[PDB]
Symmetry: D2
Subunit: 213 residues, 4 copies
Amino acid sequence: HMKIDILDKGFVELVDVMGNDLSAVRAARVSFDMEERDRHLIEYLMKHGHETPFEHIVFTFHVKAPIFVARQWFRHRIASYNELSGRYSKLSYEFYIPSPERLEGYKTTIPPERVTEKISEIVDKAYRTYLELIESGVPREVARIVLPLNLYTRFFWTVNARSLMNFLNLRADSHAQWEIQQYALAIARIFKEKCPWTFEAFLKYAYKGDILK
Amino acid sequence: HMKIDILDKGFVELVDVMGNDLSAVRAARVSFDMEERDRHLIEYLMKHGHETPFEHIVFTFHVKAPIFVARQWFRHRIASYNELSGRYSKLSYEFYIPSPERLEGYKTTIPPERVTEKISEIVDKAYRTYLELIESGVPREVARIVLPLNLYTRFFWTVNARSLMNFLNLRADSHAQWEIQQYALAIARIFKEKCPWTFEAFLKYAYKGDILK
Amino acid sequence: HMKIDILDKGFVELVDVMGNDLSAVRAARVSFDMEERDRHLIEYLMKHGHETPFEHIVFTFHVKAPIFVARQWFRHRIASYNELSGRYSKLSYEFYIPSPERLEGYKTTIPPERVTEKISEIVDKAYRTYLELIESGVPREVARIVLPLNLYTRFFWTVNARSLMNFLNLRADSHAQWEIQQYALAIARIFKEKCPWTFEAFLKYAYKGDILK
Amino acid sequence: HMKIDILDKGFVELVDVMGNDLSAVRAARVSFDMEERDRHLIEYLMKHGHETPFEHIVFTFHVKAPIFVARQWFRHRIASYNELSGRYSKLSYEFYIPSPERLEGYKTTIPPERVTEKISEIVDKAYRTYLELIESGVPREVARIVLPLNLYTRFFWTVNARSLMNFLNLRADSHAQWEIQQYALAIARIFKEKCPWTFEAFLKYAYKGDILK
Ligand SMILES: Cc1cc2nc3c(=O)[nH]c(=O)nc-3n(C[C@H](O)[C@H](O)[C@H](O)COP(=O)(O)OP(=O)(O)OC[C@H]3O[C@@H](n4cnc5c(N)ncnc54)[C@H](O)[C@@H]3O)c2cc1C
Ligand SMILES: Cc1cc2nc3c(=O)[nH]c(=O)nc-3n(C[C@H](O)[C@H](O)[C@H](O)COP(=O)(O)OP(=O)(O)OC[C@H]3O[C@@H](n4cnc5c(N)ncnc54)[C@H](O)[C@@H]3O)c2cc1C
Ligand SMILES: Cc1cc2nc3c(=O)[nH]c(=O)nc-3n(C[C@H](O)[C@H](O)[C@H](O)COP(=O)(O)OP(=O)(O)OC[C@H]3O[C@@H](n4cnc5c(N)ncnc54)[C@H](O)[C@@H]3O)c2cc1C
Ligand SMILES: Cc1cc2nc3c(=O)[nH]c(=O)nc-3n(C[C@H](O)[C@H](O)[C@H](O)COP(=O)(O)OP(=O)(O)OC[C@H]3O[C@@H](n4cnc5c(N)ncnc54)[C@H](O)[C@@H]3O)c2cc1C
Ligand SMILES: O=C1CCN([C@H]2C[C@H](O)[C@@H](COP(=O)(O)O)O2)C(=O)N1
Ligand SMILES: O=C1CCN([C@H]2C[C@H](O)[C@@H](COP(=O)(O)O)O2)C(=O)N1
Ligand SMILES: O=C1CCN([C@H]2C[C@H](O)[C@@H](COP(=O)(O)O)O2)C(=O)N1
Ligand SMILES: O=C1CCN([C@H]2C[C@H](O)[C@@H](COP(=O)(O)O)O2)C(=O)N1
């Protein structure tokens, strides 16, 4: 199974997939039966905005990402999500700490290594407060409110190729936050491997972003 | 592949499926790893309305049905469709003719065999007019407007198990038109075979209709 | 209330509306408080694909259209529909008969007036068969299957400005069937009147079709 | 405009509304024209699960809530959202601090007043770190990752009465976190005021929760 490491502790993993490039061809033609013409049809559909045939290609991913990344990701309503709960489980001590390279191009009056240090210090104090509240009998759903947005979470994501292409237009792009761009690059890599003709036609005719290819 | 004959000339065929009962278990727990407890969890989810885990189970069907059946079916917006076009193709001489048994329980002043005959006569005249218009150079998208609602159509339908359960609540039920009930019974049969635990839990705790089991 | 006649017997009527251009501005800024900058923001959102603020503008239309037009229209899943039922009511003798001008640009071996005549003759025979079945005790849901696709239907349509813009890209365009193009032109007229800044920005930066303006 | 205070610093405000109880009646009947029978029809629709007519009633709310509440709320995909951004704006020093009464029924080995104190102390240190990072030139989208989940956010929410009833079934209920229950009680109050017949029929026949009425 295709698994890609993202950020310092995150990942994107392909759990399951239904269909391939030919599923979009079989659905568009409403074919009974189970190539230059099939590839030409994918390019035609892509070129002219006939995107419904790509809805018959479905992916299930397992993602580990910080909450501030998941908040942006979960705004994609045309998909399915199941995520770890802070109400029902004790949350793990796992936080996204930016690399000093994250601040490249930014003049800071604090050294980038000291930025890294200050982020680590506050997440350690917040996690210590969280544990002290839990261990004192405070319910989990209340104790977790002191935890910061760089806490890692995990979720299952089921999405079809049309909504995935919308996600790549918006997230595999320089306007999107750098951290979610890194997840979108991995999603694109998996999409390219499972659906080469759809992905190549998407980049050529319909992809709106500025980082892919 | 599971294929079921419906009405006089229709069918329901399973084209593809992603996941099974355990997909709903793996998504709900956000499991890394790939049974009495798993079956108990499905029943708990079903019993308490936690339906999002069943969205990770996805089906693709190939359906041949009359247009009046497809019009009701296509009202289910939480799914994907690709259908044959009367604008782009010459439509086939294939119509749904009710069996004389379709009128059981109805007192008619015309014999049920003569009802069958009158339906056949008008669809033959309409199809003859359609062909005369086509053969005279009338564009297909205009010529087909004389064709009746019992004309057979075909489509690909991609739907997840949660939306499929909503479809079974509404269509595998005595309030739904008898013709779509027959398609819903076949969809239920395929759903039961691919997801036995989800289907049994659905019938026991969440199914709202009055014909299944 | 804005009402527009379409085809020979159809119409588009605006029933209700929530919001205006400023609703998209108030939502995008998450404003507490209730113009060159506001118009500039609409153009920026439109230009860069930030379409979610336009979802806060909602319309309700009352449409009378032939079934073959409604079948294309009802494929727009991101909206709400309520339509007249052939199961529950006796259907009216009202059919779309194309004007002889509908065949302009098509060489026909039958005069365009005789095309009009042949369409009228078959819909009259089909409606007569429908009435004979109803009057003989055949249930309505079965009797109506002989009725042709140019039968008029009516529905309520609730749709937000973002999904409406998607509908205008696809239906107010030469690739769409001429009959639904005529309904989309009327929808565009109503949209322009209620949301002038959004409509002008849509035409300038995001509209994909080839007939508007 | 109906505005309700929630928690220590939050609120729910009705911004706009389209339609009323009669909109669900006018849509269900597809009425041209603009009461015991109308109220009976609402109860019938509610009783038998014919929920699509209530989609023609649409609300726009302005909500101020902590992020952990907004994360649960934003899982309701059949709606529209526009929220304040931590990427684009400097975030305000406003946090949800639970009242000592929030821990009623829980035996804690730390006094409930000291729980309140420990939550305030860590959010003050996190906000101070956030400001130090911002003032040192760290981009906002990175600096805000140290901020905790009880930070207040604000958003516009456009939702129709059917999706709102689903939200009330799940959130105006004892299984939902107490904090979002308080927002759902205010949403219910606004819904009852604008749609009295729909709300009363909802409570009697379709409401699944255990706190309303
Ligand atoms: C760079 C960037 C900046 C952003 N800034 C902000 C911000 O400051 N604040 C904020 O709140 N959000 C912000 N967002 C989030 C953004 O508004 C979207 O919520 C997100 O990008 C998901 O896009 P989507 O709606 O197209 O996707 P999905 O929700 O998956 O929808 C897919 C498609 O379905 C259709 N659709 C789905 N539901 C509806 C509906 N109810 N009505 C109409 N059409 C619908 C649309 O065609 C849509 O493109 C930002 C996003 C990006 C990429
Ligand atoms: C016996 C029967 C009689 C009917 N009679 C009529 C009739 O006379 N006229 C008529 O027009 N229709 C009629 N219908 C169709 C009916 O109104 C629905 O369109 C159809 O049953 C699909 O149901 P659904 O909306 O739940 O499914 P889907 O469209 O697949 O939606 C699935 C679920 O998603 C949610 N949902 C999806 N989109 C929205 C949205 N925009 N807003 C809110 N929630 C949403 C709801 O929770 C819904 O249950 C009838 C249906 C039946 C079964
Ligand atoms: C000229 C023309 C020819 C056509 N020919 C055919 C044909 O031969 N056969 C046929 O079956 N259809 C055909 N269609 C219909 C077409 O495939 C669409 O169903 C219709 O145009 C509605 O478009 P939509 O999906 O974008 O709109 P909506 O259903 O309203 O969706 C709005 C947006 O929401 C998003 N969205 C909604 N639901 C989903 C989902 N489940 N997955 C992913 N994204 C989603 C997409 O971003 C979409 O653009 C044709 C349409 C046109 C205009
Ligand atoms: C007490 C409680 C505990 C929860 N625990 C968790 C948890 O631990 N982890 C977690 O991730 N979530 C959890 N949730 C969130 C939950 O899974 C839902 O995401 C949330 O309640 C929204 O419900 P909804 O899907 O019905 O609403 P919406 O997303 O608004 O959908 C409305 C309706 O539309 C239909 N629908 C919409 N989109 C689809 C689709 N793609 N496929 C099928 N049907 C669709 C369904 O009929 C649905 O009821 C919890 C919720 C509650 C209330
Ligand atoms: O690039 C972006 C910015 C904003 N958002 C959404 C996610 C949240 O719902 C909200 C604020 O996100 P915040 O800017 O604090 O990361 O807007 C988003 O999805 N992508
Ligand atoms: O049982 C039903 C009845 C009505 N409808 C929808 C389908 C159409 O959009 C419309 C009329 O369908 P008609 O009653 O003529 O079969 O209502 C439906 O989906 N199921
Ligand atoms: O221009 C078009 C063509 C096809 N369709 C949809 C509507 C139906 O679901 C199906 C066939 O429509 P038919 O071509 O017979 O009008 O495809 C559509 O929505 N617009
Ligand atoms: O009552 C609940 C619990 C869980 N969730 C969703 C929201 C998040 O996407 C995720 C975890 O929420 P967390 O339990 O940490 O509040 O599940 C939800 O919507 N309602």
